[PDB]
Scaffold this active site. Structure first.
Site, short mmCIF file in Angstrom:
data_model
loop_
_atom_site.label_atom_id
_atom_site.label_comp_id
_atom_site.label_asym_id
_atom_site.label_seq_id
_atom_site.Cartn_x
_atom_site.Cartn_y
_atom_site.Cartn_z
N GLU A 1 -17.69 -12.50 15.47
CA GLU A 1 -17.44 -11.24 16.17
C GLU A 1 -17.30 -11.45 17.67
O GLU A 1 -16.43 -10.83 18.30
CB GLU A 1 -18.56 -10.24 15.85
N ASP B 1 -18.97 -2.60 17.21
CA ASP B 1 -19.07 -4.04 17.39
C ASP B 1 -18.73 -4.45 18.82
O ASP B 1 -19.43 -5.29 19.41
CB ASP B 1 -18.16 -4.76 16.39
N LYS C 1 -11.29 -3.08 3.40
CA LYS C 1 -12.10 -2.95 4.61
C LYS C 1 -11.29 -2.36 5.76
O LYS C 1 -11.81 -1.55 6.53
CB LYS C 1 -12.68 -4.31 5.00
N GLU D 1 -13.77 -3.14 16.10
CA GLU D 1 -14.62 -3.47 14.95
C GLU D 1 -13.97 -4.62 14.20
O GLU D 1 -12.87 -4.47 13.66
CB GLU D 1 -14.80 -2.26 14.04
N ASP E 1 15.01 6.62 -24.50
CA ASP E 1 15.93 7.17 -25.48
C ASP E 1 16.14 6.15 -26.59
O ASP E 1 15.90 4.95 -26.41
CB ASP E 1 17.27 7.55 -24.85
MN LIG Z 1 20.56 7.81 -24.14
#
Ligand SMILES: [Mn+2]
Ligand SMILES: [Zn+2]
Ligand SMILES: [Zn+2]
Length: 1937
Positions: free
Chosen positions: A50, A88, A114, A101, A1160
């Site tokens: 960090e 942070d 996250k 952060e 179909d």
């Molecule tokens: Mn058809």
């Protein structure tokens, strides 16, 4: 302590850069305890991460871990009671805050999770911190790796490994340990057994409501009885009562229905299209006013271009004064022109560019001269120094390149302008906003005014899209009911004739729909033509298609030439209908034409649905659809009506009507409105769920449902499975009956359907969702503004110019680059850019430091101007302000006063709204447990470790709704998050594997698609019952619970294990999908909140604030998102249709075969033993399908005349061509990034169009159209350009290279240079193939370029300096010589030869066309061509010298000479080199038949027929992958390392010479990488995609005959001589010693060139069989090759069989105890029908015609299924041949065993309890044989075809064939002697060089004994015999006598 103590010493290589590092290190090193060690190590690593991550962004590390409230309370800032959040990294400056952060996630899933969870918690704070506080900018630093900038990037992984080892060694819960190890690995499908699957007291009721009726073990006969009873009940309860679903046609009733619904009678509109439509009236007026009736202008246009160019530099930071300086310059030049040459203001202006008291200006603006001089009167007296400043500013800090020598610094003399104004009187337009009919009676006009109508429509469309090009950042000088006196309107011009022009006036800019006014100007008198209101982006099709439409309609009308008198009435009607369609684009017209198509489809057949006529009517508005509907209905009636003589030629009528109905593809599909379409999509999505009653409200999004939610979910689940088999009331509501489902399951399990569970290849091997369609999401805007403000804060280490705006242009997609990056934005894009600019500027201003908005949204950037008047805004912003404005423009803009600068710059301009916004924002009117404290640093808490039956502890499978554009109606679209995307991917992979294991389904299998096609064609040609079933609401009706129940009821048996795979994970994922959350679009929410009757709007207002909050998340039972579960739905539909076809076969004794496509189906029914007795069958089938979730649409048709599948119509005899569909597809989709790719796209489209027999005269018009399009853009015509004109039917056997060569050949009239180049290419080809000495040296010679390479090839062939200076003279201009054209087009926001890119694409795995082309033409006008710098195209084309030396005039602007390009020689390349390359490329592609010369040759337009390509390849026809890669690695090593193969793990096979050094891929690949327009390597790795071409006979007889004779002039070897010389060598080599007749004595001879000579139609004398075997690379040795006596034919058929031996041994325990058969028969009489194993050994004695014999036995192992009583059930079969037999013998045997009266057929099976009595030892009978018969599949085991004895046999490697005296000796007996001729010279030519003397002795002594068996006295008895006399062997020639 091994690793505990070593960790303390290994981490010592750390730098304590900050105080915190040392403060934590002193505590970690001085504490050795296992319980805090892991925590301290993890937290110190996280602090490292960090601190580095934020300190990279000018950080202050949060060392107290305190909240936002206290860090704001440190200084003087009030607390607005902010929500608690721990930051942070924080950075406060003035009244601005930056919050960062950071985190680390190694996998993309948790990283995205996250990020999307952190961005929201950072954004929900601004709404509270801005209301009564300061601003902020949120930044999120996400890292996918533990790398940093403090360590050497090698210790972090070591520390991680040591830590995980210490953790796994000793601990101290269950899931907190599984995530810690998972969150520290590097990289890591199904089989999720690591999960827990804990119950939550809710899945109990799910299983109780889902799996009570599911048994899946029902017998077979009881289902038969139940279906019989159901049919008997159906026949006399619902069909005899009249409650069916289908009916006969009664064509007269259909005609009456169409005339009633289509032809409007109660309407007040007249029968004339011109007076109904405004655009048609306008075009009629213009065409009937046009048909029936000089350096000044070019200087004016040049200075117009100069001022328009200088306006784009915005070097004045103001829009008003810039335009004022421009019109000052314009009027000064105008008065400087009118000083002399009095015949210029009236002759060359009225006929040029001027109208009544108005002049053209910059930005296509037209301004009145009176207002012009009046505004010029301003700025004088109050600012007399204006002209001086503007004159002295264009010299310094300016380009200083201008021709304004006197037209600039001159003071405008107003008296002359007043005189000019009094010369021409005011005749301004009127701008008509918001009964006698005289329109020439279009039906009876000449054949010239209609073409003029089309031309005028094209010109008007061009003018409209040109008005579309107007700039966006443009404001008029003065701003503005029913009539408006225009003075400052925008105008476009179009030329129509020599004197008259047309003017298009409008007032708005952008891409919205506007209102336009069209005027004319004949000789200066400006007349009025009319006005209209339309959208400019819907007229892109007719921009230049004025000849294509004419040709296509002419051909469509001539289609009906069978009756002279019918086409004369349909021609003008068709043309008027097309015209009315073009002048009125709308979706209703497309829907109407689709309904007409369905009407025709139902009319052609015999039975149709009862709800058909209700799907054809559409509500017409604006009185514009009435005329087009009437025209279409009248055409349909005129073609279909009639009593007896109305079907003389019905195929032509059907084709014409189909092409007319398919005219809907002409109107484009570009979502006329986005918000309305989104609202309608939400309506169509949420309506069925509200109608059903299971749409829940916003869930917890975590996997926790309330009691009411689960209650209503279970209620919906019960209602879904609560349908009975007798009630006819529920036939249109979703749901399924469990009885029929159990029936189908039990029927599929016991191998009864055409499909079974015998599958192979076991399948078990950052945008926001609430806004889809927006060009920019809130997250991206916020990230951009945060990054920009962070960069600006880092830069201040004040003052800032407008260059910060440049930053906005750098990260989203130096004034020149700024303008180039700013021009590429759209109207919405420029609005979003202005919003982002405002945000960045206000943020920087706050860093440097009416009452109705507080109660409403306090955001000042969104205050609408539609709530206040304009006069109040104009008068309030101009009030008294002392400290709010400041004096001057202050271009430097230091920090602290940017607010005042912005207000002043907005005030000096014309717009006052931004001034009011800045004035408002200035006035301050906005005011030690390890499970809780350890999941905040880097712990991936959201990792899936334990899941429930509704979620996965990592979300709830969130989705997002959107629409997709189609022709008829928009389709749904669901886009998911990454986790649900992976789950859907796994599910669809499993289901697609299961489907690929199946056979009948055709969705991802083109073979089954072709099978269905040919079956349908054969049925239509024979006359079977074809039924095309389309289903309505397939998507929004299905539910995952149905698939869950189906997979629960199935078994999915393994192929070889029979293990009943447990589908546990699949059911878990399906249960997850059942509880998915669909998020509603925010646009529909805002539209329903802000605020006609609508059901979904009623539901929104009812769920707005009554029960809960505004609906944003919708979960339900039946969703099945379209495009999510496609494969599962396909498989379910397949099995249901198989069950249905089985039921129909059993009930109505017909033969059905069904093909499905998941949406179909098509059913081909063969009936026994006209078609009026099948209505009950089809209605029963419809009822059974409706009992399932397979509701059939009223568009489904049943008949015997026409069939349809995947929009592919088949009729009796042929197939419909579908001309207009391909025509509209060609005219549309003009996506151009470079002219070459557009040319290639049009090439592919025209190829696939001409494939379906369209024409050869229409494609020429499309090529001319695209040529004119690329020419209009300013690129100029090039030799290659678009597709060539004057083509022929030779699109077959011809690729893009061939047509490019044809174009280049057509450039030259009498080809002598190109013929010489073709001869040189043929010579190179012969010397590289026949001579075969050329490789990798042409690579070294070509890589230089075009000039030296061509002369090198020439001097290799042969030439002199004459040829060098002659051929290399023809040059053409290549603008992309030093690279490619730089350009930024209309792409979406947020962002080397081409062969590398194509290979990278091969290895790896909403925008309009009008706006795209407009941006293309606009970007092709800036500095694009590169050199060294960049410049213009016209600048390059202006440097050419017009020499005109009789060689650069054969084709202007295409071909030049050398000295004509002395000024510009960098862009000059020879075209003959490209021709050579193209000829060689066609040779390596498709044979050498393109080296000859073209010769010309010496039918009712309706004789169509199919043709096949006649190509011949010599390039290793297979040509797979891993061959181009090796060639690139060999030839270009650095180019193979870089830009290629980073994403590859199979380099070993591409490196170990996998068939290295291809025949031509070596040299046929280097021409492709250097030339930018060949494209053959990307073409060789592709299929033909057509394989057949339908063409008319009239085009086949007019083609060019280009077939090449052999370049060797038939002089090489005369393959007959090859054969006879090879035979002579063989016989004379055999007659010196005995040799075996194997491949060792046939391939070991030089004259064995029989493997060559690809045309192998003729063999030597007798060795056909062994040659055909060697073509397959046989390994045979010798056998009786006596095919003269046919060994494959006339063979004895003494066939028989033997007993069997059952596998899965259980018979040894029941064989001996009979000593009976009675107990065995009783055992064979729960049910214990297991699998059956059949073993057979069939031995035959196949003989032959010649003297020979053979004994061949076959072993057959069959894995089948035992039957209950009737016959048997089969699964698979396998065969294995063996024994002594020749190739023909085994071929005959294997052919007859597969085509015998055996199992395939009557099976000739004699059971008689005989073979059972032999296997089961017994000598008794029970008077019951119970004969059985097999129904084997029909596998084809015919893959040996060799001398091989099929992998087994007691006899091998005997009977060797030898040769002594030209006679075959099998074992010592002479078979025969084949005749061989030598003609004397050949025998001595062989006798020349031999081994020794005795060999020649043997040969010459054995020759004449072989001459006794031949007849050859042609051996010349002359000097050649005296040469043979060298071998003095008189005894040998005198022994035979
Ligand atoms: Mn058809
Ligand atoms: Zn009229
Ligand atoms: Zn010339």
């Amino acid at each position: 302590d091994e690793y505990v103590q070593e960790l303390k010493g290994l981490i010592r290589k750390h730098i304590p850069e900050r105080c915190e590092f040392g403060h934590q290190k002193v505590t970690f090193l001085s504490q050795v305890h296992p319980s805090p060690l892991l925590t301290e190590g993890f937290k110190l690593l996280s602090s490292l991460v960090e601190l580095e991550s934020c300190e990279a962004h000018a950080c202050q590390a949060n060392t107290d871990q305190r909240f936002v409230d206290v860090i704001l309370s440190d200084n003087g800032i009030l607390c607005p009671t902010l929500p608690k959040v721990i930051p942070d990294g924080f950075k406060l400056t003035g009244k601005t805050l930056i919050l960062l952060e950071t985190f680390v996630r190694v996998n993309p899933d948790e990283f995205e999770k996250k990020w999307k969870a952190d961005m929201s918690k950072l954004l929900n704070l601004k709404h509270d911190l801005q209301k009564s506080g300061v601003t902020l900018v949120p930044i999120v630093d996400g890292r996918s790796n533990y790398n940093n900038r403090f360590v050497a990037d090698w210790v972090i992984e070591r520390i991680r490994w040591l830590l995980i080892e210490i953790l796994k060694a000793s601990k101290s819960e269950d899931q907190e340990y599984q995530r810690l190890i998972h969150s520290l690995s590097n990289v890591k499908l199904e089989n999720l057994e690591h999960l827990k699957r804990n119950s939550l007291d809710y899945d109990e009721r799910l299983n109780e409501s889902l799996f009570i009726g599911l048994k899946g073990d029902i017998r077979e006969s009881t289902v038969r009885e139940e279906l019989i009873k159901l049919k008997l009940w159906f026949k006399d309860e619902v069909f005899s009562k009249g409650l069916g679903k289908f009916k006969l046609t009664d064509r007269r009733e259909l005609l009456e229905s169409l005339s009633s619904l289509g032809a409007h009678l109660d309407s007040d509109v007249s029968s004339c299209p011109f007076c109904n439509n405004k655009l048609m009236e306008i075009v009629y007026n213009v065409t009937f006013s046009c048909v029936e009736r000089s350096n000044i202008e070019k200087h004016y246009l040049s200075v117009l271009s100069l001022c328009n160019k200088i306006k784009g530099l915005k070097v004045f930071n103001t829009r008003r004064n810039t335009l004022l300086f421009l019109d000052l310059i314009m009027v000064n030049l105008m008065v400087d022109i009118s000083d002399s040459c009095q015949d210029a203001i009236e002759s060359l202006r009225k006929s040029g560019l001027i109208v009544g008291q108005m002049v053209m200006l910059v930005n296509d603006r037209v301004l009145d001269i009176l207002e012009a001089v009046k505004l010029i009167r301003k700025k004088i007296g109050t600012n007399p120094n204006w002209v001086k400043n503007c004159s002295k500013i264009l010299e310094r800090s300016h380009p200083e390149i201008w021709h304004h020598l006197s037209t600039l610094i001159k003071q405008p003399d107003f008296n002359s302008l007043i005189s000019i104004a009094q010369h021409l009187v005011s005749d301004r337009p009127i701008m008509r906003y918001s009964k006698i009919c005289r329109h020439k009676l279009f039906q009876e006009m000449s054949s010239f005014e209609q073409m003029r109508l089309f031309k005028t429509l094209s010109s008007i469309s061009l003018s409209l899209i040109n008005s579309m090009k107007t700039s966006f950042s443009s404001r008029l000088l003065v701003n503005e009911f029913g009539n408006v006196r225009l003075r400052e309107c925008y105008a476009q011009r179009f030329y129509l004739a020599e004197s008259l022009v047309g003017f298009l006036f409008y007032q708005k800019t952008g891409e919205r729909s506007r209102c336009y006014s069209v005027y004319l100007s004949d000789n200066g008198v400006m007349s009025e033509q009319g006005s209209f209101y339309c959208d400019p982006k819907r007229f892109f099709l007719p921009v230049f298609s004025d000849e294509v439409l004419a040709g296509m309609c002419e051909e469509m009308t001539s289609w009906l030439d069978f009756d002279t008198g019918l086409m004369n009435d349909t021609g003008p009607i068709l043309r008027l209908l097309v015209l009315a369609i073009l002048c009125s684009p709308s979706k209703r017209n497309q829907t109407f034409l689709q309904g007409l198509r369905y009407f025709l489809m139902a009319f052609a057949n015999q039975i149709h649905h009862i709800d058909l006529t209700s799907k054809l009517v559409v509500e017409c508005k604006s009185s514009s659809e009435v005329v087009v509907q009437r025209l279409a209905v009248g055409l349909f009636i005129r073609l279909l009506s009639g009593e007896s003589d109305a079907s003389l030629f019905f195929s032509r009528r059907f084709k014409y009507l189909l092409n007319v109905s398919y005219l809907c593809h002409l109107i484009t599909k570009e979502t006329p409105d986005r918000l309305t379409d989104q609202i309608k999509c939400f309506e169509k999505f949420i309506e069925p769920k509200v109608k059903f009653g299971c749409a829940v409200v916003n869930p917890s999004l975590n996997g926790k449902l309330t009691v009411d939610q689960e209650d209503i979910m279970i209620n919906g689940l019960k209602k879904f499975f609560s349908k009975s088999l007798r009630d006819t009331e529920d036939v249109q509501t979703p749901g399924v009956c469990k009885e029929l489902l159990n029936y189908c399951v039990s029927l599929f399990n016991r191998g009864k359907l055409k499909v079974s569970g015998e599958l192979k290849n076991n399948p078990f091997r950052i945008p926001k969702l609430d806004e889809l369609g927006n060009i920019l999401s809130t997250y991206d805007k916020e990230k951009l503004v945060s990054a920009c403000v962070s960069s600006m804060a880092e830069r201040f280490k004040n003052l800032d110019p407008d260059s910060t705006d440049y930053l906005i242009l750098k990260n989203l997609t130096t004034q020149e680059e700024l303008s180039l990056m700013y021009e590429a934005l759209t109207e919405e894009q420029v609005e979003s850019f202005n919003e982002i600019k405002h945000d960045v500027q206000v943020a920087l201003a706050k860093m440097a430091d009416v009452s109705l908005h507080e109660v409403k949204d306090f955001d000042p950037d969104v205050l609408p101007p539609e709530v206040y008047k304009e006069l109040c805004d104009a008068v309030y912003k101009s009030s008294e302000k002392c400290n709010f404005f400041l004096e001057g423009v202050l271009d430097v803009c230091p920090l602290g006063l940017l607010l005042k600068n912005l207000t002043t710059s907005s005030y000096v301009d014309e717009e006052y709204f931004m001034c009011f916004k800045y004035l408002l924002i200035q006035g301050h009117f906005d005011q030690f447990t390890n499970a809780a404290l350890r999941n905040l640093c880097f712990y991936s808490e959201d990792s899936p470790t334990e899941f429930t039956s509704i979620s996965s502890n990592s979300g709830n499978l969130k989705f997002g709704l959107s629409y997709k554009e189609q022709v008829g109606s928009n389709r749904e679209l669901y886009v998911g998050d990454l986790n649900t995307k992976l789950m859907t991917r796994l599910v669809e992979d499993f289901s697609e594997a299961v489907g690929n294991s199946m056979k009948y389904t055709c969705l991802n299998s083109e073979k089954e698609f072709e099978r269905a096609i040919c079956d349908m064609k054969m049925a239509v040609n024979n006359g079977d019952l074809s039924c095309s079933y389309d289903h309505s609401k397939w998507g929004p009706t299905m539910s995952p619970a149905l698939f869950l129940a189906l997979l629960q009821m199935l078994e999915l048996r393994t192929p070889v294990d029979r293990s009943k795979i447990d589908l546990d994970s699949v059911k878990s994922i399906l249960k997850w999908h059942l509880h998915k959350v669909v998020e509603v679009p925010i646009n529909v929410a805002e539209a329903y909140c802000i605020g006609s009757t609508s059901l979904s709007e009623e539901f929104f207002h009812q769920t707005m604030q009554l029960n809960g909050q505004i609906p944003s998340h919708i979960m339900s039972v039946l969703d099945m998102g379209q495009g999510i579960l496609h494969n599962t739905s396909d498989l379910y539909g397949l099995i249901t249709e198989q069950f249905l076809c089985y039921a129909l076969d059993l009930l109505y004794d017909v033969i059905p075969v069904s093909y499905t496509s998941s949406d179909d189906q098509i059913t081909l029914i063969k009936t026994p033993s006209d078609a009026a007795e099948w209505l009950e069958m089809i209605c029963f089938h419809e009822f059974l399908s409706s009992k399932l979730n397979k509701f059939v649409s009223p568009k489904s048709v049943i008949g015997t005349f026409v069939a349809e599948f995947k929009s592919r119509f088949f009729v009796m005899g042929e197939e419909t061509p579908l001309l207009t569909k391909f025509v509209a597809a060609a005219l549309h989709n003009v996506k151009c990034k470079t002219p070459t790719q557009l040319s290639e796209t049009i090439d592919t489209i025209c190829d696939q169009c001409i494939a379906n027999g369209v024409s050869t005269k229409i494609v020429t018009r499309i090529s001319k159209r695209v040529n004119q399009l690329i020419r209009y853009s300013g690129y100029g015509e090039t030799p290659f350009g678009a597709i060539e004109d004057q083509d022929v039917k030779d699109w077959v056997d011809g690729s893009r290279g061939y047509r490019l060569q044809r174009k280049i050949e057509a450039i030259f009239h009498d080809d002598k240079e190109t013929s010489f180049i073709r001869n040189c290419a043929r010579k190179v080809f012969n010397d590289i193939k026949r001579g075969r000495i050329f490789e990798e040296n042409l690579i070294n010679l070509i890589g230089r370029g075009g000039d030296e390479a061509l002369t090198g090839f020439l001097q290799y062939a042969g030439c002199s300096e004459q040829e060098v200076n002659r051929v290399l003279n023809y040059r053409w201009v290549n603008l992309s010589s030093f690279g490619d054209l730089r350009l930024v087009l209309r792409t979406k926001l947020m962002t080397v030869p081409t062969l590398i890119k194509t290979l990278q694409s091969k290895l790896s795995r909403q925008s309009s066309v009008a706006s795209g082309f407009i941006g293309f033409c606009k970007s092709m006008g800036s500095k694009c061509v590169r050199d060294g710098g960049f410049l213009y195209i016209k600048e390059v084309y202006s440097g050419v010298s017009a020499c005109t030396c009789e060689i650069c005039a054969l084709k202007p602007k295409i071909i030049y000479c050398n000295n004509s390009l002395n000024k510009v020689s960098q862009f000059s390349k020879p075209i003959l080199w490209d021709y050579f390359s193209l000829v060689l490329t066609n040779a390596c592609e498709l044979g050498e038949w393109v080296f000859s010369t073209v010769k010309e040759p010496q039918n009712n337009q309706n004789f169509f027929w199919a043709v096949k390509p006649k190509v011949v390849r010599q390039i290793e026809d297979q040509l797979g992958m891993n061959h181009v890669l090796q060639s690139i690695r060999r030839n270009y090593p650095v180019l193979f390392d870089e830009h290629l193969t980073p994403f590859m793990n199979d380099l070993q096979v591409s490196r170990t010479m996998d068939s290295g050094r291809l025949k031509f891929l070596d040299v046929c690949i280097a021409l492709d990488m250097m030339n930018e327009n060949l494209g053959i390597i990307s073409h060789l790795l592709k299929t033909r995609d057509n394989s057949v071409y339908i063409v008319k006979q009239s085009d086949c007889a007019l083609a060019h005959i280009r077939q090449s004779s052999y370049t060797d002039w038939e002089l090489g070897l005369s393959p007959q001589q090859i054969c006879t010389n090879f035979k002579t060598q063989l016989v004379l080599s055999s007659m010196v010693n005995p040799l075996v007749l194997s491949t060792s004595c046939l391939k070991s001879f030089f004259w064995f060139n029989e493997v060559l000579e690809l045309e192998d139609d003729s063999q030597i004398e007798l060795a056909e069989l062994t040659d055909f075997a060697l073509m397959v690379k046989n390994q045979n040795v010798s056998r009786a090759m006596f095919v003269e006596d046919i060994a494959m034919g006339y063979v004895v058929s003494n066939f028989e069989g033997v007993r069997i031996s059952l596998s899965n041994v259980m018979v040894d325990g029941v064989q001996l105890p009979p000593q009976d058969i009675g107990e065995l028969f009783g055992l064979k009489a729960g049910l214990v029908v297991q699998i059956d194993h059949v073993r057979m050994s069939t031995k035959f004695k196949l003989k032959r015609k010649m003297v020979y014999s053979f004994s061949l036995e076959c072993i057959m192992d069959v894995g089948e299924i035992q039957n209950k009583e009737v016959i048997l059930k089969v699964v698979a079969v396998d065969q294995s041949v063996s024994g002594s037999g020749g190739n023909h013998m085994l071929l005959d045997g294997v052919s007859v065993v597969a085509s015998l009266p055996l199992f395939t057929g009557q099976a000739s099976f004699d059971l008689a309890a005989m073979l059972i009595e032999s296997n089961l030892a017994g000598s008794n009978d029970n008077f019951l044989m119970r004969n059985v018969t097999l129904d084997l599949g029909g596998f084809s085991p015919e893959l040996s075809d060799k001398y091989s004895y099929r992998l087994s046999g007691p006899e091998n490697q005997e009977d060797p064939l030898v040769l002594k005296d030209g006679a075959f000796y099998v074992g010592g007996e002479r078979l025969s002697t084949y005749k061989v001729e030598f003609t004397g010279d050949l025998v001595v030519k062989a006798l020349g060089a031999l081994e020794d003397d005795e060999s020649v002795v043997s040969m010459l002594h054995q020759l004449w004994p072989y001459l006794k068996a031949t007849s050859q006295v042609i051996l010349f008895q002359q000097e050649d015999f005296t040469i043979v006399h060298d071998l003095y062997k008189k005894q040998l020639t005198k022994s035979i006598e």
